[PDB]
Design a protein around this motif. Structure first.
Motif, mmCIF file in Angstrom:
data_model
loop_
_atom_site.group_PDB
_atom_site.id
_atom_site.type_symbol
_atom_site.label_atom_id
_atom_site.label_comp_id
_atom_site.label_asym_id
_atom_site.label_seq_id
_atom_site.Cartn_x
_atom_site.Cartn_y
_atom_site.Cartn_z
ATOM 1 N N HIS A 114 0.851 -1.185 0.000
ATOM 2 C CA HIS A 114 0.000 0.000 0.000
ATOM 3 C C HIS A 114 0.894 1.244 0.000
ATOM 4 C CE1 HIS A 114 -1.695 -3.170 2.883
ATOM 5 N NE2 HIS A 114 -2.268 -3.438 1.723
ATOM 6 N N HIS A 115 2.201 0.997 0.095
ATOM 7 C CA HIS A 115 3.251 1.929 -0.325
ATOM 8 C C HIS A 115 3.248 3.262 0.420
ATOM 9 C CE1 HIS A 115 4.381 -0.988 -3.352
ATOM 10 N NE2 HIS A 115 3.114 -1.038 -3.725
ATOM 11 N N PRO A 116 3.660 3.230 1.697
ATOM 12 C CA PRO A 116 3.637 4.345 2.638
ATOM 13 C C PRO A 116 4.518 5.519 2.204
ATOM 14 C CG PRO A 116 5.084 2.650 3.439
ATOM 15 C CD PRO A 116 4.370 2.068 2.257
ATOM 16 N N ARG A 117 4.002 6.741 2.297
ATOM 17 C CA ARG A 117 4.805 7.925 2.011
ATOM 18 C C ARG A 117 5.847 8.146 3.102
ATOM 19 N NH1 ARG A 117 1.767 13.241 0.556
ATOM 20 N NH2 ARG A 117 2.092 12.243 -1.484
ATOM 21 N N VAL A 118 7.114 7.938 2.759
ATOM 22 C CA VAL A 118 8.207 7.936 3.723
ATOM 23 C C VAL A 118 9.202 9.045 3.402
ATOM 24 C CG1 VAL A 118 10.125 6.568 4.650
ATOM 25 C CG2 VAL A 118 7.960 5.456 4.055
ATOM 26 N N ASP A 119 9.179 10.114 4.193
ATOM 27 C CA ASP A 119 10.057 11.256 3.943
ATOM 28 C C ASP A 119 11.328 11.208 4.763
ATOM 29 O OD1 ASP A 119 8.858 12.934 1.926
ATOM 30 O OD2 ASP A 119 7.253 13.263 3.391
ATOM 31 N N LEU A 120 12.381 11.818 4.229
ATOM 32 C CA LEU A 120 13.676 11.867 4.897
ATOM 33 C C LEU A 120 14.141 13.310 4.879
ATOM 34 C CD1 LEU A 120 16.507 10.938 5.919
ATOM 35 C CD2 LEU A 120 17.087 10.523 3.527
ATOM 36 N N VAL A 121 14.423 13.843 6.066
ATOM 37 C CA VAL A 121 14.885 15.221 6.207
ATOM 38 C C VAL A 121 16.157 15.198 7.040
ATOM 39 C CG1 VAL A 121 14.394 17.452 7.304
ATOM 40 C CG2 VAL A 121 12.596 16.273 6.034
ATOM 41 N N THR A 122 17.202 15.862 6.562
ATOM 42 C CA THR A 122 18.452 15.949 7.313
ATOM 43 C C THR A 122 18.492 17.304 8.020
ATOM 44 O OG1 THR A 122 19.691 17.112 5.590
ATOM 45 C CG2 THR A 122 19.569 14.699 5.435
ATOM 46 N N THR A 123 19.206 17.387 9.134
ATOM 47 C CA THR A 123 19.184 18.613 9.905
ATOM 48 C C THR A 123 20.091 19.667 9.303
ATOM 49 O OG1 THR A 123 20.951 17.844 11.336
ATOM 50 C CG2 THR A 123 18.656 17.432 12.004
ATOM 51 N N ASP A 124 20.644 19.378 8.131
ATOM 52 C CA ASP A 124 21.537 20.319 7.467
ATOM 53 C C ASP A 124 20.785 21.602 7.167
ATOM 54 O OD1 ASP A 124 23.573 18.072 5.429
ATOM 55 O OD2 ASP A 124 23.869 18.936 7.439
ATOM 56 N N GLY A 125 19.572 21.445 6.642
ATOM 57 C CA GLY A 125 18.710 22.562 6.273
ATOM 58 C C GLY A 125 18.452 23.528 7.411
ATOM 59 N N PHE A 126 18.629 23.049 8.641
ATOM 60 C CA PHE A 126 18.398 23.855 9.827
ATOM 61 C C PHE A 126 19.656 24.471 10.414
ATOM 62 C CE2 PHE A 126 13.979 23.087 10.081
ATOM 63 C CZ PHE A 126 13.795 21.815 9.544
ATOM 64 N N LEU A 127 20.794 24.309 9.757
ATOM 65 C CA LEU A 127 21.950 25.100 10.152
ATOM 66 C C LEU A 127 21.630 26.584 9.986
ATOM 67 C CD1 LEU A 127 24.830 23.012 8.585
ATOM 68 C CD2 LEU A 127 24.710 23.670 11.036
ATOM 69 N N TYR A 128 22.083 27.410 10.921
ATOM 70 C CA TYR A 128 22.051 28.842 10.696
ATOM 71 C C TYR A 128 22.876 29.125 9.447
ATOM 72 C CZ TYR A 128 20.040 29.715 15.287
ATOM 73 O OH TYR A 128 19.206 29.706 16.383
ATOM 74 N N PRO A 129 22.463 30.121 8.657
ATOM 75 C CA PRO A 129 23.245 30.548 7.506
ATOM 76 C C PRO A 129 24.607 31.078 7.915
ATOM 77 C CG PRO A 129 21.031 31.384 7.347
ATOM 78 C CD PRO A 129 21.119 30.716 8.685
ATOM 79 N N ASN A 130 25.537 31.158 6.970
ATOM 80 C CA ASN A 130 26.906 31.523 7.317
ATOM 81 C C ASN A 130 26.973 32.917 7.914
ATOM 82 O OD1 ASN A 130 27.715 29.044 6.435
ATOM 83 N ND2 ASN A 130 28.890 29.784 4.678
ATOM 84 N N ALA A 131 26.268 33.845 7.277
ATOM 85 C CA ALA A 131 26.213 35.228 7.730
ATOM 86 C C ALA A 131 25.810 35.237 9.204
ATOM 87 C CB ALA A 131 25.193 35.979 6.911
ATOM 88 N N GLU A 132 24.862 34.377 9.561
ATOM 89 C CA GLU A 132 24.326 34.385 10.913
ATOM 90 C C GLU A 132 25.264 33.649 11.864
ATOM 91 O OE1 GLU A 132 21.495 34.665 14.200
ATOM 92 O OE2 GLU A 132 22.379 35.910 12.639
ATOM 93 N N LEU A 133 25.947 32.639 11.333
ATOM 94 C CA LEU A 133 26.946 31.951 12.125
ATOM 95 C C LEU A 133 28.103 32.911 12.419
ATOM 96 C CD1 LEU A 133 26.899 28.464 10.347
ATOM 97 C CD2 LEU A 133 26.233 28.857 12.721
ATOM 98 N N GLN A 134 28.600 33.615 11.406
ATOM 99 C CA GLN A 134 29.635 34.625 11.619
ATOM 100 C C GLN A 134 29.198 35.547 12.754
ATOM 101 O OE1 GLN A 134 29.933 35.508 7.450
ATOM 102 N NE2 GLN A 134 31.642 34.060 7.331
#
Ligand SMILES: Nc1nc2c(ncn2[C@@H]2O[C@H](COP(=O)(O)OP(=O)(O)CP(=O)(O)O)[C@@H](O)[C@H]2O)c(=O)[nH]1
Ligand SMILES: Nc1nc2c(ncn2[C@@H]2O[C@H](COP(=O)(O)OP(=O)(O)CP(=O)(O)O)[C@@H](O)[C@H]2O)c(=O)[nH]1
Lengths: 307, 307
Positions: A114-134
């Protein structure tokens, strides 16, 4: 001495495959495998297939639990076209293979009936941007807990598990070493969501993403092995990723073996090792299943939480 | 903004009683009620009875979950004469009533059908003895995390939940302000175990007792109210507990109202307040249900974790 855990070896673990179908080719395995990773179809049969079984068993049983609270609240009975999404967390050190583990696990579960919708999200997307990390003085603490917008991450997973129709995560470029302006990953009421990151298993003075996991995985190995995998993969990348003139790290392509070993060792020592020791490893005791890797990348022991 | 929590008022909460029988007299309530506590049969009807319902619903559903892992492991099917014990944690500040809450909850669940063995253990028994506290310089940090043999406590709860036939906890004397030589509390494969203490909800770099809870309660109130309850109850004890010439604190019986207010305030400020702020309150976000008390001890709001 009674224990919350039970240890396995591959022998013992593989027996619990029962008759779960292998639904994955050599060609597909390849597409999920990261540079330096040794995983083959055998390991998927003897290690990932019991794991997929265990998860199938727990998904149904985990639904009972939310239904009971629904019954209690006298709530409308749960739409079977959309139950409460099962959240799985996958953690471990840089370079230990955890990302491959999560991709593979995604593949296996997307290929149930029945083929379950299985998503994968890495926490990379949630790193602060470089400008904000600086701004926060954190350009050399990328991967430490505080280099993440943990609040946004919690909002995301909370959004998904609470039954929202869609939730958005930002997207990270490894090429450019920064968050991509305008890019979004969009996740739409999956049945299973896998969340993969260094610290996903962390706990704290606030409700965190690890408190939403219905199941968690921690991919483990002796610390010196991981340094070796990390250093080796750094040398290797001189002719893959760093080779791209676009790469934020192009200047590394021209390093000698020993210049590259020196650079890789210093990044290990100043960033990745301290993170692993101070933040990642202390989360291991809480993982549902630890996958223990020998010096060759081979998963040969497993630790399961029965309590 | 989706949320892991849903807030209730007493109105809303009491409706979820459905038709749960009240099985408890005025005389029995009294025997469970601590000095200064206002709880009456009404509050038990409108607050504790939905709670007991919720728990009944979750006990069955929580069993599915352990059975799935048993099914997976290909294990002998679970003895119905002894399932996996349901662990409930009850936390909050000194003087907030949490102990009464746990006693009452014990009473309610012992009075279900087929009459489940429901044990209650307080973390007092796991305080280091005075001699040992003196050694660690902790005679004025009684109630802080480090004043407990957390390891022994974890061994205890782990013993019980893993299905041991019996486990022993040491026993604390409030009279003598120390652990009682030779005294043991013995807990024998209960169906439900309630564990009550200041920090039971704490988390850490190791698997802890909060990781074994199937359900948790945190009894809450505005900080200044608790100070008031604490100070008042201290004055009150001049003619109850301190009145005993045996009491470790007999010298307090002879204090004037204002001498006693001064002493009580200083203990609050130097011990109980800092513990509440630094250790207890940060655990609140993880509790299954928070019971919020108004300045009169009355539980008027509730926060439930639906995720
Ligand atoms: N461009 C670039 N990519 C990198 C670098 N280091 C790691 N990556 C990539 O970014 C991700 C982070 O890898 P890492 O954090 O080591 O975790 P991992 O679980 O070992 C990754 P996998 O299992 O796919 O090999 C991976 O997809 C990896 O291929 C780098 O220095 N430059
Ligand atoms: N002898 C003595 N007993 C105390 C003292 N303070 C508290 N107690 C008793 O020891 C236990 C600790 O109470 P406390 O830590 O304030 O928690 P609580 O949940 O408010 C206690 P309850 O709900 O029964 O009133 C209670 O059973 C209380 O009656 C004290 O200073 N001396």
């Amino acid at each position: 001495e009674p224990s919350p855990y039970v240890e396995f070896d591959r022998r013992q673990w593989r027996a619990l495959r029962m008759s779960t179908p292998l639904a994955l080719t050599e060609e597909e395995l390849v597409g999920l495998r990261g540079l330096g990773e040794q995983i083959d179809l055998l390991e998927v049969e003897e290690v990932y297939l019991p794991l997929a079984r265990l998860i199938h068993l727990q998904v149904a049983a985990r639904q009972r639990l939310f239904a009971a609270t629904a019954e209690f609240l006298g709530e409308p009975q749960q739409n079977p076209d959309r139950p409460v999404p099962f959240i799985i967390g996958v953690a471990g050190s840089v370079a230990v293979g955890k990302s491959t583990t999560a991709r593979v696990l995604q593949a296996l579960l997307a290929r149930w009936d029945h083929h379950p919708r299985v998503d994968l999200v890495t926490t990379d997307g949630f790193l602060y941007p470089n400008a904000e990390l600086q701004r926060r003085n954190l350009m050399h603490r990328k991967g430490f807990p505080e280099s993440y917008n943990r609040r946004a991450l919690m909002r995301f997973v909370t959004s998904v598990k609470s039954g929202s129709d869609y939730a958005c995560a930002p997207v990270y470029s490894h090429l450019h070493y920064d968050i991509i302006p305008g890019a979004e990953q969009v996740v739409r009421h999956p049945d299973i969501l896998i969340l993969e990151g260094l610290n996903v298993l962390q706990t704290g003075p606030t409700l965190m993403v690890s408190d939403l996991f219905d199941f968690s995985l921690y991919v483990d190995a002796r610390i010196e092995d991981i340094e070796q995998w990390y250093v080796s993969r750094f040398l290797a990348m001189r002719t893959t990723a760093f080779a791209d003139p676009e790469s934020h790290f192009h200047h590394y392509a021209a390093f000698s073996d020993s210049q590259a070993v020196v650079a890789a060792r210093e990044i290990w020592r100043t960033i990745n090792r301290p993170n692993l020791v101070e933040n990642i490893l202390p989360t291991r005791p809480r993982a549902t299943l630890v996958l223990r890797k020998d010096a060759d990348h081979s998963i040969n022991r497993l630790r399961l939480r029965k309590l």
